[PDB]
Design a protein around this ligand. Structure first.
Ligand SMILES: *[C@@H]1O[C@H](CO)[C@H](O)[C@H](O[C@@H]2O[C@H](CO)[C@@H](O[C@@H]3O[C@H](CS(=O)(=O)O)[C@H](O)[C@H](O[C@H]4O[C@H](CO[C@H]5O[C@H](CO)[C@@H](O)[C@H](O)[C@@H]5O)[C@@H](O)[C@H](O[C@H]5O[C@H](CO)[C@@H](O)[C@H](O)[C@@H]5O)[C@@H]4O)[C@H]3O[C@@H]3O[C@H]([C@H](O)CO)[C@H](O)[C@H](O)[C@H]3O)[C@H](O)[C@H]2O)[C@H]1O
Ligand SMILES: *[C@@H]1O[C@H](CO)[C@H](O)[C@H](O[C@@H]2O[C@H](CO)[C@@H](O[C@@H]3O[C@H](CS(=O)(=O)O)[C@H](O)[C@H](O[C@H]4O[C@H](CO[C@H]5O[C@H](CO)[C@@H](O)[C@H](O)[C@@H]5O)[C@@H](O)[C@H](O[C@H]5O[C@H](CO)[C@@H](O)[C@H](O)[C@@H]5O)[C@@H]4O)[C@H]3O[C@@H]3O[C@H]([C@H](O)CO)[C@H](O)[C@H](O)[C@H]3O)[C@H](O)[C@H]2O)[C@H]1O
Ligand SMILES: *[C@@H]1O[C@H](CO)[C@H](O)[C@H](O[C@@H]2O[C@H](CO)[C@@H](O[C@@H]3O[C@H](CS(=O)(=O)O)[C@H](O)[C@H](O[C@H]4O[C@H](CO[C@H]5O[C@H](CO)[C@@H](O)[C@H](O)[C@@H]5O)[C@@H](O)[C@H](O[C@H]5O[C@H](CO)[C@@H](O)[C@H](O)[C@@H]5O)[C@@H]4O)[C@H]3O[C@@H]3O[C@H]([C@H](O)CO)[C@H](O)[C@H](O)[C@H]3O)[C@H](O)[C@H]2O)[C@H]1O
Ligand SMILES: *[C@@H]1O[C@H](CO)[C@H](O)[C@H](O[C@@H]2O[C@H](CO)[C@@H](O[C@@H]3O[C@H](CS(=O)(=O)O)[C@H](O)[C@H](O[C@H]4O[C@H](CO[C@H]5O[C@H](CO)[C@@H](O)[C@H](O)[C@@H]5O)[C@@H](O)[C@H](O[C@H]5O[C@H](CO)[C@@H](O)[C@H](O)[C@@H]5O)[C@@H]4O)[C@H]3O[C@@H]3O[C@H]([C@H](O)CO)[C@H](O)[C@H](O)[C@H]3O)[C@H](O)[C@H]2O)[C@H]1O
Ligand SMILES: *[C@@H]1O[C@H](CO)[C@H](O)[C@H](O[C@@H]2O[C@H](CO)[C@@H](O[C@@H]3O[C@H](CS(=O)(=O)O)[C@H](O)[C@H](O[C@H]4O[C@H](CO[C@H]5O[C@H](CO)[C@@H](O)[C@H](O)[C@@H]5O)[C@@H](O)[C@H](O[C@H]5O[C@H](CO)[C@@H](O)[C@H](O)[C@@H]5O)[C@@H]4O)[C@H]3O[C@@H]3O[C@H]([C@H](O)CO)[C@H](O)[C@H](O)[C@H]3O)[C@H](O)[C@H]2O)[C@H]1O
Ligand SMILES: *[C@@H]1O[C@H](CO)[C@H](O)[C@H](O[C@@H]2O[C@H](CO)[C@@H](O[C@@H]3O[C@H](CS(=O)(=O)O)[C@H](O)[C@H](O[C@H]4O[C@H](CO[C@H]5O[C@H](CO)[C@@H](O)[C@H](O)[C@@H]5O)[C@@H](O)[C@H](O[C@H]5O[C@H](CO)[C@@H](O)[C@H](O)[C@@H]5O)[C@@H]4O)[C@H]3O[C@@H]3O[C@H]([C@H](O)CO)[C@H](O)[C@H](O)[C@H]3O)[C@H](O)[C@H]2O)[C@H]1O
Ligand SMILES: *[C@@H]1O[C@H](CO)[C@H](O)[C@H](O[C@@H]2O[C@H](CO)[C@@H](O[C@@H]3O[C@H](CS(=O)(=O)O)[C@H](O)[C@H](O[C@H]4O[C@H](CO[C@H]5O[C@H](CO)[C@@H](O)[C@H](O)[C@@H]5O)[C@@H](O)[C@H](O[C@H]5O[C@H](CO)[C@@H](O)[C@H](O)[C@@H]5O)[C@@H]4O)[C@H]3O[C@@H]3O[C@H]([C@H](O)CO)[C@H](O)[C@H](O)[C@H]3O)[C@H](O)[C@H]2O)[C@H]1O
Lengths: 135, 135, 135, 67, 135
């Protein structure tokens, strides 16, 4: 009798270990994706505007998917920080897509202590910095 | 008595499980091989002929092992689709082996609607495309 | 008893899988070598002779290791197609090695329909084309 | 083991034996830096392009020239 | 009884194998680091002195971290073979760091048989040769 009953108990234990292992693996098998992007970008800064002109890109991406951050200055548009938003890009505009041939103008404001030589900015896509004016 | 008899039964069951597992593994341990090939190939297309000239290759391979496929045209030789066959390669010919220094001429025919600008072809070896004229 | 016997069977199976894998890898770990060569070569063609003059090379190599192929003409020497052989290079000759300062003369014959403007040739080493008169 | 050819040494089929390895020879041990030369013979119908061979140790194939 | 006891023994064996494997891996996971360095160096040799002038370097490094070796001559300073040591570099000296703009003078002695045309030297950092006067 007893060697067969002991075998049935060990099968029951084995299934719970396998079910446990499956939940451990689930912490590895997510959140990996191709996030690399690369663009030819040129820029010019003035007391009132930043100009951004794109010559080429690795892929065609929405101007709403790109986040812009700034130091030494402030944006004249206050709703948020996507490139489409601060640049005043309408959905019908040619500049709705970030690719070679797209140009943007961003309006900015400086304090009494701030100066043009102190201003810099960065473009971020999927958590990677794709451009930095101070490079 | 009974604990020993129960043990003999469990050994008999164990052998059949091991024999079962061996047949499961046989579905994994076959059909893996090194099929990669790479060649410097140049080509010119005309209303009557395709010319193919080889400058180098990763390995030396038989011209009968390479399959050719075509669109926008048709072959003048109708027996099949190996490179040796459609190019009229005899077994004594220098061009029996695909390597740097081997040249081939393939004769072709166009319909009333077909034109030279529409023709393209590919070379396939061991199920991989090794050249494509429209790349 | 049975969990230990099952373990011994799984070790026996494991060794055969490892031995199988070793024979799969053997199809990758051969036939890779540095075959690149590069030479400064100049040439002149006439109704009777091809002249080939070498100014520099990436390495010093035997004139018997180089294969020559021709179109629009034929060689006067019929034994084979190595450069040393068709050029009549003796083992004591200065031109036994292909390097800067080595010169070769190859004798050729044309049919009633062939002409000097139609002749061309190539030099091949380790399956790569190293010179082509029609480039 | 060999196909498409034959060994010039006929006593057997161990690597040491067909290669003519003496017990004092450097090549008595199979390791990095060991080199062997095996002499062979071809028939009137056999050719170099047809020859291939394999090395076997403890019943496993460890090398195959036709891989 | 016995299938559970056999399972407890196999767990005990498993832990010792895992502990063994951990000590095998420790032979791989050490002694890998970025040791590459690259410098623009120029030098002049005389019957009494070697002059060494640095124009640029990949990184800024201590003159005590660089080892110098010589042939065809001997150093006038006998304590050792670091660059700082044989060149007489004090800790306050500008030339304490190896970078563009650092210059060194090393005093040397020749035998009755030695001559200036026979002298050469090398600079070594982290086991890599970074300069060789006879290149
Ligand atoms: C699983 O597999 C599937 C199949 O392959 C998918 O691949 C999935 O991946 C997800 O897919 C969903 C659906 O495509 C994605 O959700 C979209 O997310 C984008 C953001 S993104 O940066 O552009 O990539 C948008 O938010 C998009 O929304 C569209 O629709 C919005 C609402 O429009 C709807 O309602 C109006 C009426 O108000 C209708 O006229 C219209 O037809 C539609 O029904 C739009 O506002 C939006 O415009 C702007 O959106 C963002 C800002 O939010 C901006 O970045 C864009 O550039 C654009 O200017 C856009 O047109 C999402 O699509 C879904 O749409 C449904 C809607 O019901 C239609 O089905 C929802 O209402 C939501 O809007 C939204 O879920 C998701 O991102 C992918 O992960 C795999 O996971
Ligand atoms: C992506 O693609 C899109 C689409 O192609 C854009 O091109 C985007 O780049 C943006 O382009 C816009 C448009 O040029 C830029 O916005 C302008 O900034 C200029 C200054 S500039 O020196 O001329 O170059 C202007 O300020 C312009 O606005 C005009 O409108 C102002 C407000 O007028 C509005 O309101 C009145 C009522 O009060 C209405 O009657 C009128 O119709 C209009 O709706 C005017 O004050 C302004 O006059 C003076 O402006 C400046 C001083 O600020 C001065 O330098 C000028 O010479 C001029 O004398 C001018 O007439 C801005 O355009 C936007 O206009 C909207 C308005 O709602 C209409 O849409 C806003 O009110 C803001 O005024 C402004 O956003 C933008 O900066 C670029 O990013 C590409 O990236
Ligand atoms: C690999 O390596 C091999 C070996 O080196 C090849 O080089 C291969 O490349 C192939 O080369 C062959 C040979 O050149 C190519 O085939 C020829 O195509 C030409 C056209 S071309 O413009 O001259 O360049 C010819 O069509 C040539 O055929 C000749 O033969 C035709 C038929 O004659 C046969 O039958 C008669 C009886 O009717 C016999 O008396 C005769 O002896 C022969 O057996 C002739 O019609 C033809 O005359 C005219 O041809 C064309 C018009 O089509 C015209 O442009 C010419 O100016 C000429 O006036 C010519 O005399 C083709 O060669 C093959 O010949 C065989 C024949 O059986 C002998 O073997 C076939 O019958 C076909 O005619 C043809 O396949 C080939 O295209 C290349 O792939 C390398 O890749
Ligand atoms: C690498 O390095 C090597 C070594 O340095 C070579 O330099 C090689 O380049 C080769 O050089 C040789 C030698 O020059 C070239 O071969 C010659 O081609 C010339 C033609 S040319 O216009 O003068 O330049 C000659 O044909 C020369 O042969 C002579 O020999 C012929 C045969 O004579 C032989 O047989 C008779 C018996 O019948 C013997 O008595 C005699 O001793 C000899 O063994 C003669 O016919 C020939 O006379 C006429 O030749 C031509 C017409 O073809 C005419 O233009 C001349 O003006 C002359 O009146 C001449 O006396 C070729 O040299 C080789 O000679 C051997 C012979 O066995 C001796 O070795 C062969 O029999 C061939 O005749 C021939 O191969 C070669 O072409 C270059 O590749 C570098 O690349
Ligand atoms: C492991 O490590 C060991 C030890 O280091 C080996 O290196 C082994 O590799 C083997 O090496 C041997 C030695 O090189 C190879 O055997 C030789 O094959 C060559 C041919 S080759 O082209 O020169 O490379 C020779 O055949 C050589 O034999 C010589 O001996 C022949 C017979 O002479 C014997 O008998 C006469 C009496 O008749 C005696 O006087 C003499 O002293 C000797 O005992 C000669 O015929 C031969 O002359 C010609 O040989 C060939 C033609 O076959 C020709 O190409 C040559 O240019 C030359 O003109 C030459 O003098 C082989 O060596 C062995 O010699 C023994 C002999 O008993 C002495 O030990 C046998 O009789 C055989 O002749 C032969 O086995 C071997 O192939 C490699 O495997 C590493 O793997
Ligand atoms: C683990 O993680 C840590 C934290 O990140 C480290 O990264 C560690 O890496 C090791 O760090 C230690 C400590 O930094 C390194 O040891 C130094 O090795 C260098 C050699 S190196 O080529 O310059 O790179 C030096 O030997 C250095 O010593 C300094 O101190 C010496 C003694 O000075 C002490 O005593 C005097 C009184 O006599 C005091 O006034 C002084 O304040 C100090 O307490 C100096 O002689 C020495 O000068 C010269 O040293 C070398 C020649 O030996 C020469 O090449 C230099 O250019 C320089 O001219 C230098 O100033 C080591 O630092 C440690 O200092 C302690 C001391 O107690 C202070 O803490 C010891 O006494 C030893 O001197 C020494 O261990 C080690 O190389 C790194 O691997 C990670 O592994
Ligand atoms: C890194 O950065 C550092 C700091 O900037 C250095 O620049 C280093 O390069 C080194 O520079 C030093 C300094 O120039 C070089 O050493 C000198 O070699 C010259 C020869 S040279 O042709 O003039 O160019 C000198 O030999 C010089 O020494 C002087 O001192 C000698 C000894 O005098 C000492 O002892 C006496 C007592 O006997 C004291 O009174 C005196 O104060 C001093 O302490 C003198 O003999 C010498 O006179 C003659 O020297 C030569 C012949 O050898 C002759 O050509 C001259 O024209 C002159 O007539 C001269 O006055 C060396 O400097 C060091 O001096 C120390 C001394 O202890 C003081 O510190 C040693 O004793 C040695 O003499 C010597 O090391 C060095 O070669 C460079 O590597 C950068 O790489």
């Amino acid at each position: 009798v007893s060697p067969i009953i002991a075998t049935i108990l060990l099968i029951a234990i084995t299934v719970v270990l396998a079910a446990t292992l499956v939940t451990i693996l689930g912490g590895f098998t997510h959140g990996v994706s191709n996030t690399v992007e690369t663009a030819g970008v040129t820029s010019h800064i003035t007391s009132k505007y930043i100009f951004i002109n794109v010559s080429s890109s690795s892929s065609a991406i929405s101007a709403s998917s790109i986040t812009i951050t700034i130091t030494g200055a402030s944006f004249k548009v206050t709703s948020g920080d996507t490139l489409a938003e601060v640049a005043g890009v309408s959905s019908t505009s040619s500049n709705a897509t970030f690719t070679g041939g797209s140009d943007y103008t961003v309006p900015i404001s400086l304090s009494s202590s701030q100066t043009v030589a102190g201003v810099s900015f960065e473009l971020i896509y999927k958590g990677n910095v794709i451009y930095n004016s101070a490079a």
